[PDB]
Amino acid sequence: GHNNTKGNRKFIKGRYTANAAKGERLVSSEFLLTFAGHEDISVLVRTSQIPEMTREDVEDYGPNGVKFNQHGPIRNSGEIQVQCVETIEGDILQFIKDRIAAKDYVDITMAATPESKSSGVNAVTKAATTIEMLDCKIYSDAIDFSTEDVTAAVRPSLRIVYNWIEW
Amino acid sequence: GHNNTKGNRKFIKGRYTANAAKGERLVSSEFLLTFAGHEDISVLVRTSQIPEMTREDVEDYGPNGVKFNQHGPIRNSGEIQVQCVETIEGDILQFIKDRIAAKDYVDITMAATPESKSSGVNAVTKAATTIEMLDCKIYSDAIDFSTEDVTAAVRPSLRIVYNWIEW
Amino acid sequence: GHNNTKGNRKFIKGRYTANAAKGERLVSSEFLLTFAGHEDISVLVRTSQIPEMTREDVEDYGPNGVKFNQHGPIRNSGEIQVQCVETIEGDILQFIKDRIAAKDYVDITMAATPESKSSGVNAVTKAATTIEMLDCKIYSDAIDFSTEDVTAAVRPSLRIVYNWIEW
Amino acid sequence: TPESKSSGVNAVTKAATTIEMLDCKIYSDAIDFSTEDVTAAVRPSLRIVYNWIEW
Amino acid sequence: DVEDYGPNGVKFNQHGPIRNSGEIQVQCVETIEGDILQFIKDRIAAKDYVDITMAA
Amino acid sequence: DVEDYGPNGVKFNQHGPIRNSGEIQVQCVETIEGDILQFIKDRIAAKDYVDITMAA
Amino acid sequence: QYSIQQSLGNASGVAVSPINADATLSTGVALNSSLWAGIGVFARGKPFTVLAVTESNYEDVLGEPLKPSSGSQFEPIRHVYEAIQQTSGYVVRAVPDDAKFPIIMFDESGEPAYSALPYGSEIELDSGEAFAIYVDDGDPCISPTRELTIETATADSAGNERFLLKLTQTTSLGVVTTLETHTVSLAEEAKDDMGRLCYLPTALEARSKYLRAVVNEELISTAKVTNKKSLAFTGGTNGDQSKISTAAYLRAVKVLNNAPYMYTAVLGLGCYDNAAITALGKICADRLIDGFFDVKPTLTYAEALPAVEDTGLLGTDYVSCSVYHYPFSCKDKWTQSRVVFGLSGVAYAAKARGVKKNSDVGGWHYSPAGEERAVIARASIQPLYPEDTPDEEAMVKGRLNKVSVGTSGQMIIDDALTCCTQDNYLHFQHVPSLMNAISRFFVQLARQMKHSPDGITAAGLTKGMTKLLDRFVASGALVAPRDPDADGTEPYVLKVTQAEFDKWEVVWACCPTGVARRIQGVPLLI
Amino acid sequence: DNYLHFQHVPSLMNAISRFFVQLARQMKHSPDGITAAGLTKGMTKLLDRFVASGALVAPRDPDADGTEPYVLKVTQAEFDKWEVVWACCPTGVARRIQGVPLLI
């Protein structure tokens, strides 16, 4: 039917070895947050993010219809969505109440801690996969309670706005 | 029931042979990106695109309600969505950090590398299926981390804006 | 329970015969595009459309709230979505590159070619089911490439704008 | 035209369930053709605008 | 089969396009010399299409 | 396999990329010394990849 | 730019002929919905044989229309042109006795001898003559001259000798055109450059539509042919075609009768002979077919009514035969010369337009008359006998149809009546038409059923008839009875009765659709 | 005057002949060898491919000749003589054009 078909498995073996040459793929379940002076909440986090890390773009239409996009100033501030689990002693509620009561800025460190790169009972982090945010504000959201959800646990949603990204 | 029915399988056989006359159909999993001087990242790409290939259109209403659409200037700049996989050594994060730190423009080449057209362990590209983008800016996006995703590997999303398309 | 129920299968038989009196129903998989001087691309088309065939409408409010809609000028130009399959020799890509490189207007003929109405190996068309579009411009959209799509084939999307409909 | 209210091979209509539209304009729409739809038949879509409703 | 519904509830099934491609299952026996294994290895290694004749 | 539909209702199946990874079932028996249990415990404790040779 | 030639030769080029001050361009299209038939007199054509003509062949077949100044010879071609705008048909040509076709005989040396023979006669070769070539087409070469040219060609591969035979046409002015060329060999076993046979009679019969040849077997072997210039056929003529005896007309009608092409209408194309019209009506009644005929148009209103009775159609035997009368005048299409001819082929056009509405069974219930189906498209209409008024009631009693002016302004056929004196709902045109169509369908069904293993059976004859009658009800031809109390609601009744065992009987009754032809309005004042 | 002074007519037949020669050379390695049945399937496939490419077209007159661009048949006289023949209807070229202006 098709006269162009021809098999070549040496090439496929080459691609397989080239892909496997690099080490591993980071599983998305391996991370850690610090929250500066409140290090007891690091266990309860369940979802995190990495900031956008983009720039503004400037559009200029040249002679005729020629258009060029150019780099702009760095984007500093943004938002990050974080979800936490809630205990029966109100750790997250007390944390949010304290944050609202006194205007504070908290530094947050985002790191990746794979099982392969660890010594003893302590995780070890790498400079390449570590990012930092400074002067962050922690805000809460509406928390849903309902019956007939016997199989679910309450999970507050937190909204964090950073003001500088450093690495 | 239907008096118009009539069978003719010579016509269908002719259609089948005419369709099979051409060689093959390109599979969407066969491509390659180069990224100019950083050729060590070509392995980690997982999704790419082809630029738009369009023109601006000019609308003119003639006498009565007669309307004509006319060719306009070419469209140079656009966006391309590219997804890469992430390793435990942060190749993609380091690449994006370096790109943000220093304002740079990188030339990106997109080519199709089918298994049938290959000699030895090296793929060969064709001028008809090869496209090039010049003066590109590489920007990142929000990277999602979460627990309970033990079966998934983290995949950052990249946004690339090109400024000229050449072939 | 229901006192108005009554059976009448002569009426149903009459409806069945009246409906079956007409010949056949056109299956949506039987059509053909011509593309004027490029008749080698007719095989690779996979989806097409028929123009809108509408008119503008003029609204006038009479005494009290009486309203009337009146016929207006014919609508000439529009858009048609056409999908094609891609081979490993870049036929569609070369066609699009050539069309963008030189501003051209191509005449496109759409017709239905059922198997029942055919003689020998050649399809025969009917004037009632044939429509024509003149002075068309052929433009492309973004083409998606991705791995883990081993069961799919790459299919470019084409956007065609016509300027006159003739029959 | 329900089956219950019919005589012979001819349907009979009722004034209560009958409505009329006058001075209508019939317009077409885009008609879709595609392969791999071997189990479907082409069905044009029509758009009709009426100017008076009478009963 | 193309499916249509007429006035009221009448229904008609209509002849459609022919089915070309499909699947078929074959069971065979293996010898010492690895005939079938080598045959399948060769078929996987190089893409090709062959023509099969079935007779009753 | 890659499926395509040509003009009218004709259809073609095309060779695709090779299937690399898969799953296989093995059944074994256990001795008093805990050979298989200790083997599985060692495999789970330390991530590793081994090579298996199957001969007829 | 560069030079431009006037005529094409063998070189590759584009040529433009000189500007023509006067000429006409005519298009054409083919359709085979309904097939008509008739007889007539024309310029050229093979006489007393069935000829199939379409919209693109009625000029090549048949011929150039005869000039109206000749008199009474121009009507048939106009009728054919009017009728052929819908669908094709069949024509049989009638020719007078004093008609001859040309022929050229060749001596052993190669010199030609000219003569002519009557159409009925057969060619007999005199001793000392090798072969003769004559014109198969019934075309006299009087006004357009046809010339024959002979020249030698390369010998065959096996050694046989062959020559080129060419035919040319020259007009009166002097313009010369090329018609046909052939390679012909006198030897029995010879082959063409393409591999085909070159024997003269076989080649002429196969790939020539103008000429035929007859050879003398005894003396063909030792025959020689030399190059000759143009030789023109002489002696071929057509007698006075305005005077045609009844015998030729009856012969043409008999030729029509024995034709297997199964046409659906019979037309009287300008034939005003009573015996021929009665024979055509007999053909019409034989095949269960409609028929349209015409009385002489120059007759006044008073004399038209007896002329209908002159023909034998008026009676009970010939149902579904219509007679028209059109005493008006119009400008001819080909030459603006104010000719007068009747209405045959205009009624058939209306019937064909009505038939084309339905595609399953045809919808024969539509009457030919009306302002939509039947229109007369002619240049300028002028009454021949103004300030005269026909007696419409007398015409209705006389089964004669009338023509009136429509709302738009063009002439319209305003009635449709058949030649049946009895009051049987049969003088309406469509009522016999439905039953004839149903009868033809039944005949076709019964012919096929005879090949079944059992054969013709009463049980088998009911299912098919029910299916066809249901289809005819669906098309709208059959309607429910007007009074539901007296008669049942069903449109048709099919019943089978048995007396003894030898005699069976199958009967079906039908309620035909009615037409709307008389309307009355009654104004009032509050 | 064999329709052969046109350039493409001999070229098509020469290409078909070369394809047939290559097909028949391979078939000599078949365990059966060269057979009449074997020589029909491959030639039908090849001629269908040429028909699809546009080289062969249907005859101009459908009444006189059939609607098939090519006719392949096998003839048998006694047992020792077999015969395989195929006929083709090549595409025509446009080289002479004439225009006839008129005046209304």
Author numbering:
A (entry chain a), B (entry chain f), C (entry chain e): 2 to 168
D (entry chain d): 114 to 168
E (entry chain k), F (entry chain l): 58 to 113
G (entry chain v): 3 to 528
H (entry chain w): 425 to 528
Paper text:
The phage tail is a macromolecular machine responsible for specifically recognizing host bacteria, penetrating the cell membrane, and forming a channel for genome delivery. The conserved structural components include three main parts: a baseplate, a long inner tail tube, and a tail sheath that wraps around the tube.
To improve the reconstruction resolution, we then re-boxed sub-particles and resolved the partial structure of the P1 extended tail, including a tail terminator ring, eight sixfold sheath rings, and eight sixfold tube rings at 3.3 Å resolution, which allowed us to build the atomic models for the tail terminator protein gp24, the tail tube protein BplB, and the tail sheath protein gp22. The 53-layer tail sheath and tube of phage P1 are terminated by a hexameric terminator that covers the distal inner tail tube and embraces the top ring of the sheath. The terminator consists of six copies of protein gp24, and each gp24 consists of four domains: a central core domain (residues 23–127, 151–244), a β-hairpin domain (residues 128–150), an N-terminal domain (residues 2–22), and a C-terminal domain (residues 245–260).
